[PDB]
Amino acid sequence: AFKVNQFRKTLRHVKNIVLRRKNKERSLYDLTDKEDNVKPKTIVFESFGGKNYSDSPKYIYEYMQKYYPNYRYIWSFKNPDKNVVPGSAEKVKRNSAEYYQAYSEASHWVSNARTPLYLNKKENQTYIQTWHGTPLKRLANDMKVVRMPGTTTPKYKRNFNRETSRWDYLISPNRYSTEIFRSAFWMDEERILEIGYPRNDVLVNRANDQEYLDEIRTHLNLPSDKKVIMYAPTWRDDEFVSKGKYLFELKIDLDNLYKELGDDYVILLRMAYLISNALDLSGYENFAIDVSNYNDVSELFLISDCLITDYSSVMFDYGILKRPQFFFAYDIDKYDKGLRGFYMNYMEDLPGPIYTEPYGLAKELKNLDKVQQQYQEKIDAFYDRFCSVDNGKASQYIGDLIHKDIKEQLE
Amino acid sequence: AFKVNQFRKTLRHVKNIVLRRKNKERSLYDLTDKEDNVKPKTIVFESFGGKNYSDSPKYIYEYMQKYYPNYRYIWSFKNPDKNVVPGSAEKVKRNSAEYYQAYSEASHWVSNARTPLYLNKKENQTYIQTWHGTPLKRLANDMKVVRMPGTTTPKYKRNFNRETSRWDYLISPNRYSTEIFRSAFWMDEERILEIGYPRNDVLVNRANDQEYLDEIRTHLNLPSDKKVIMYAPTWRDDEFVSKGKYLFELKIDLDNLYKELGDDYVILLRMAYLISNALDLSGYENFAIDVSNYNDVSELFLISDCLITDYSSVMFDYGILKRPQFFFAYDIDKYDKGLRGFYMNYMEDLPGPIYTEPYGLAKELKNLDKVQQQYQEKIDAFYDRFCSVDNGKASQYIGDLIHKDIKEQLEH
Amino acid sequence: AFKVNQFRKTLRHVKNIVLRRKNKERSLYDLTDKEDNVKPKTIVFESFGGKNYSDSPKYIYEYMQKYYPNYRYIWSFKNPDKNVVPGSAEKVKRNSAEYYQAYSEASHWVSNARTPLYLNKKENQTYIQTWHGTPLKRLANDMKVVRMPGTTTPKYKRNFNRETSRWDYLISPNRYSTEIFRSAFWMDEERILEIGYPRNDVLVNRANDQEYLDEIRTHLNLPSDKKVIMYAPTWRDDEFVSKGKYLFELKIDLDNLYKELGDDYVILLRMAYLISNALDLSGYENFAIDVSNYNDVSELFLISDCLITDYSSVMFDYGILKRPQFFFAYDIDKYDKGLRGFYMNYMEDLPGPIYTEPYGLAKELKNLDKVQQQYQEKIDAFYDRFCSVDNGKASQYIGDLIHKDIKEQLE
Amino acid sequence: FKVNQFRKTLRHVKNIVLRRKNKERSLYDLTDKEDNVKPKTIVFESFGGKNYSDSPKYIYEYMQKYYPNYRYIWSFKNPDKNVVPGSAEKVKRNSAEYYQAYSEASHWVSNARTPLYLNKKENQTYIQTWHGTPLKRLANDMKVVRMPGTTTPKYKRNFNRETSRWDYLISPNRYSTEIFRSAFWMDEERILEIGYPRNDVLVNRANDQEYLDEIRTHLNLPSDKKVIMYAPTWRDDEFVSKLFELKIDLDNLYKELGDDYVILLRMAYLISNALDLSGYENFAIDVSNYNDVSELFLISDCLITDYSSVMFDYGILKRPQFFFAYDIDKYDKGLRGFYMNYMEDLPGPIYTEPYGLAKELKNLDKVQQQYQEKIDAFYDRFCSVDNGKASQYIGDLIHKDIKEQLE
Ligand SMILES: O=C(O)CN(CCN(CC(=O)O)CC(=O)O)CC(=O)O
Ligand SMILES: O=C(O)CN(CCN(CC(=O)O)CC(=O)O)CC(=O)O
Ligand SMILES: [Cl-]
Ligand SMILES: [Cl-]
Ligand SMILES: [Cl-]
Ligand SMILES: [Cl-]
Ligand SMILES: [Cl-]
Ligand SMILES: [Cl-]
Ligand SMILES: [Cl-]
Ligand SMILES: [Cl-]
Ligand SMILES: [Cl-]
Ligand SMILES: [Cl-]
Ligand SMILES: [Cl-]
Ligand SMILES: [Cl-]
Ligand SMILES: [Cl-]
Ligand SMILES: [Cl-]
Ligand SMILES: [Cl-]
Ligand SMILES: [Cl-]
Ligand SMILES: [Cl-]
Ligand SMILES: [Cl-]
């Protein structure tokens, strides 16, 4: 009478219930997850595995809120109380009974990072995967070796693969990424929507919306007369030391930037969360504004006159605006010398100069116009390759597609 | 008080019974295994995860068959039928119900390699570990990376440490080794018995027993008029290609060795189980003798006039005989250039010459006595550092220790 | 070492879970129930094995609702949606996860009948048994033969003894009952609270509460000028015939009772659940009121000018009111001729006449004050033996015992 | 994965881990498939394994001669204390070997009930010889059974379960058949009226003077003396003091008959080792533990019994019987709790005092004429059926049965 798989689960759950394991919520879900639980107008959102309300899901959501308030919107979070969601969406805490109800019921899953393999994406449901940016470093399959603790390359890749096979829909911002995903994610071009990122929507539809460039600016208490510079270096293992209490000042040399640019500029510093609540910005008030904790990074872009980064997929997002970029790669030699661990030729076809010391960077920074002119060539070359595909309608395209998928399911 | 461990095993075992899983024998054992099971006069032996009747545990056991024949002797094998054990030992097949009774009951485990962590070594029993050679490559905790599929370096070292912590006694051949075990295996000097390897007993006790040497030689159908070169390279992953059906002839070049040394010598080829049954010694009959499957390596050392290896710990055992050794390291370049990946300075303090090419090896082999004087300096020095401790009396020291351990247990 | 009792339960539970047995809830309970589940201020109630909200456990629960609202009250039923409980108590259905949780946590059980042997009464827990009436017929240990199916006399006695051994306190109404309980129940005088029946409080406290008599009288649509007779015979197996679709009219002859008293009296029939829904009362309306399903038997006693019974322990409770009783023992012949199957001498020391034919009865029932005087002797003697204990503070004594018992534990 | 197999599976996990003794049984229950049956294996047991005796014996002895070729198995409580001739191997009850035997056999031969935890598959032919013509009513025909631990309905139920598995049931007479068809819930089609295999030697040997001689000197009996057998059934009433001499008055019998007779006492196993027979040496022989009872009847010139089914066996020899019913009042005054009319149609006199009994015993030949009538009426009602070829009939039937299975 009893099937073998149900049995294995039946025991697992007996063990979680009697030993008071916290995963009892999960095992129950495994036993009772039926293809019949799906409610065609329940859609579940989650971004970066629950840290945020943010990114492509946010916008795919905000659009679907203005055009179909009639559906049941659920968001998932690590700490639902510490997040704020506009509209009629209800929120669920990761790993609670509600969390699993939601994922079981939903006809659609919107997400921008991997969702856990312990969740059944039934053949009954559509998992739309937006991902979170054009790749610069190699990921998934294309990685060579991965000495990540607790997990080995083959196992890590087997698992990443089990997860992409669940992607009914994978978004792409460009053929560069489409070409890449196909190999890296074990995808079939059939399922890749080359429609651009919904989070990048507002880079197209608002680049000139002054009352809105002003909300952002006066939200951050930014000076009335000063142009904006964003700096966003990627995380580097290296630089962590001594409990993470007192850091050494940024290599970009802040005291310098204050001397050279303090009159004409202000610098939005966007660091990793560990450098940030370790950074003392005493006596840089109204010059360096810490911006690492700001929810929506696309808004930061809209108000920036240029973007200093190093090895980061954000250059591909900012490029939509065709503004100048500088690449402050002080540790470019420690990074393989001439590394092909990069899907692109970093040494040639990015839209700005590569600086290793931060002083000719600052000087150059004085006159943006000379840089915009000098590099207009490489900046447009960049815009056609990696940015020429966003409509401003990406949130629309996905949201509509959902809707469409859910009229059919309504027959 | 609810016993949360006992619960986890009753479930696991219910699972194995209902699903017809083969580990059902294992999970019963785990559920039911009490200290009260141990029979002070039961002793288990296993060598190389149950592949052989061989090595230290063989000798530790042969000694005991002769001086304490009244204890219950159980040997463990992957395939007991395909193994022949002298004396009174009963044999158990691994992962069979008897395998488990035998380890549950035994007051002493003897092994020369790792025994599985699913077996419970109660506070009640004594796990004596002999290991299987003086370390040259670095092992266990001393390793840097281990891209061994299925397991990550931390979780492999974790497990190893789990195993060594169960070693009540660990045998050692030399102060060199001891220093290393204490680190590589997480050992406390208290538990190390620097007494030499029981398997190396015959290398001392019988090295000049002519009649015994002759049983070994004629058991191997060797010429009478010819001296013996043994060749034992280690396993190389690199050299594997094409299903393991037709290897390329050994780098040592048999054809050349034949021309050069065919008149005075015969060469004993001791390879890995794979390079062996791919080899075609057609037309090297009575010169190249395949000897890969010969159960007792120590008997081979005894009849061997010199040894050729590369990076093997067998060089430390054969050193006991103060005979010549050549090191054909054809691929020394592809092993890190200058590799401290060894506990010793491989380029300097070993008992013979290092050859990267097999042709000047052959020549140098034509006159063993020159090599023996040329290197008597180094051969002796290598003996003082790695072989000085072997008594000949090592199966005795373990045999004794055990019996002495098991009178104590037959009183209070 | 190996905990064998636990092993036995783990196997049992594994068995129920895999086979989809309804008792899986029970066996989980047995495996996990532990002394530390007991919340000192949780108290379970149940009456007659979960049939009602009624009897002593009710009058205990209602008293603690007034003076000790702070505690957690749980009531147990077969069908909780079909029972109504005033106050703060939660209702658990029998044999359900919440029922077992309830008995696992409670510091005190209250019941008036036997509670199942599969519930563990930990040393931790105080089990109060109020029982449900002064014995007439002989019960438990004092029985001679019990040919009840599937179970032999020894095995029945063994299980009853198992139950009484967990009664931490047993209520008794009179020395006569104590004498008996002590033997029939294998009880220690020490554990017998001889305080009367809580369910019988109102017969002391409220006999004269003219406004309360009325709520009860108009609850039953009783005519105004008419006096009230209550007939309540015990169940007789012999009489059951024909699936229970049509009984031969009651031996008491309602047709006659109408002609004789249909002007002055109304008669309240309290019968067994099978005789009651087989009774045709066409044309006895406003004379014969079926009152079998009435929830509170004491309220009926209060408004009863006299009780007609036969071999029931109700004669004992109704005695507190010192009103007249008639014993219509039509079948006294069949019951042994001269049976000592009764703890008391039925033939001699009861508070009224033994009629074996219902015609003399009716006549006598015409003039009630003549009966009252004729027996005001036998009636007082009976009240001095069986009813002289109830101060109507019985519900209180128990509530305060519990409340005291659970102050001690809170330290 | 079946629900029945899962229940057994769990049971065995329990028995094995708790080292219960029924581990041997739960295993049997798990692995017992129809495929285990070996057509030429036959199991014998008599009285639940206390003996090598009775009908199963004679069926076995007969097949030991005409079919030495089959595998014969006998089941005992204490195999090391029983002597079995011929090829048969033996099994101890509730051992691995016992469940083997019973799973493997194509035929079970027994004379009393065999346990319900044993699986009688469609594959197997269970033959019940039972053990005697009923005088006390049994099984379904019982009124009340206050046997401790169990209830009348649950007892009749379990018995009905056992008889439902008797493929063949043996019967000594129409009178028994009548009673079996009702008392054991039996089909008349399944009853073989052939008489008792164990009575075979009462027909075939009664005049074998050399056999009679072995039996007689086996017991060290005197040569000039005739032989009386006394076989009073058991009475619960009479157990006391963890005894009092027999109500038959051995002293009197020794006085009145000691010079012509010798008296064989066949008692219940409990009165046997409470009896002191000092000073009756060579008059009263205790014969209560003698393995074979048909050999006793053979050498008995008469039988003194009371309420026992042995009168029906001994009848075959048309010899005088006596019925010392000293306590026939306690036994219900006039009880029809008997299938027959005791007070009438039995082959002998009902005595209630032992003294007129002793006198009548003096001259057997006069007893034998006085009663020739009633003795014949008795041989005709209850013993006419016995061929002396019963053992033969089963033996062959089994042989005849297992030539079929062999195709
Ligand atoms: O019978 C089990 O529940 C326990 N088993 C089986 C594995 N468990 C672990 C799990 O929860 O994933 C479950 C199982 O696979 O049935 C072994 C374990 O505890 O490590
Ligand atoms: O009843 C059974 O299913 C078997 N067990 C009981 C089954 N339970 C224990 C219990 O119900 O008493 C656990 C198990 O399935 O064995 C009794 C036996 O030995 O015949
Ligand atoms: Cl829906
Ligand atoms: Cl022992
Ligand atoms: Cl094998
Ligand atoms: Cl460990
Ligand atoms: Cl080797
Ligand atoms: Cl358990
Ligand atoms: Cl509490
Ligand atoms: Cl309900
Ligand atoms: Cl309610
Ligand atoms: Cl009562
Ligand atoms: Cl009526
Ligand atoms: Cl099934
Ligand atoms: Cl069983
Ligand atoms: Cl066969
Ligand atoms: Cl029987
Ligand atoms: Cl059966
Ligand atoms: Cl019988
Ligand atoms: Cl006597």
PDB file of C-alpha atoms in Angstrom, chain B residues 1-3 6-7 10-11 14 31-32 34, chain C residues 1-4 6-7 10-11 14 31-32:
ATOM      1  CA  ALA B   1      15.088  10.433  30.792  1.00  0.00           C
ATOM      2  CA  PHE B   2      14.359  10.175  27.063  1.00  0.00           C
ATOM      3  CA  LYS B   3      17.382   8.650  25.339  1.00  0.00           C
ATOM      4  CA  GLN B   6      18.760   5.335  21.042  1.00  0.00           C
ATOM      5  CA  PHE B   7      15.742   6.904  19.284  1.00  0.00           C
ATOM      6  CA  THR B  10      15.719   2.588  16.236  1.00  0.00           C
ATOM      7  CA  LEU B  11      14.382   4.801  13.445  1.00  0.00           C
ATOM      8  CA  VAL B  14      13.454   0.470  11.050  1.00  0.00           C
ATOM      9  CA  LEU B  31      21.242  -0.409  18.177  1.00  0.00           C
ATOM     10  CA  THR B  32      22.186  -3.396  20.255  1.00  0.00           C
ATOM     11  CA  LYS B  34      26.612  -3.031  24.570  1.00  0.00           C
TER      12      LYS B  34
ATOM     13  CA  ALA C   1      22.109   1.217  28.900  1.00  0.00           C
ATOM     14  CA  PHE C   2      19.326   0.140  26.599  1.00  0.00           C
ATOM     15  CA  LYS C   3      16.005   1.752  27.593  1.00  0.00           C
ATOM     16  CA  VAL C   4      13.624  -1.028  26.588  1.00  0.00           C
ATOM     17  CA  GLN C   6      11.113   3.473  25.187  1.00  0.00           C
ATOM     18  CA  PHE C   7      12.107   1.087  22.403  1.00  0.00           C
ATOM     19  CA  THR C  10       9.062   3.862  19.327  1.00  0.00           C
ATOM     20  CA  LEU C  11       8.189   0.641  17.489  1.00  0.00           C
ATOM     21  CA  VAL C  14       6.360   3.760  13.960  1.00  0.00           C
ATOM     22  CA  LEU C  31       6.483   8.246  23.604  1.00  0.00           C
ATOM     23  CA  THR C  32       6.966  11.881  24.429  1.00  0.00           C
TER      24      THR C  32
END
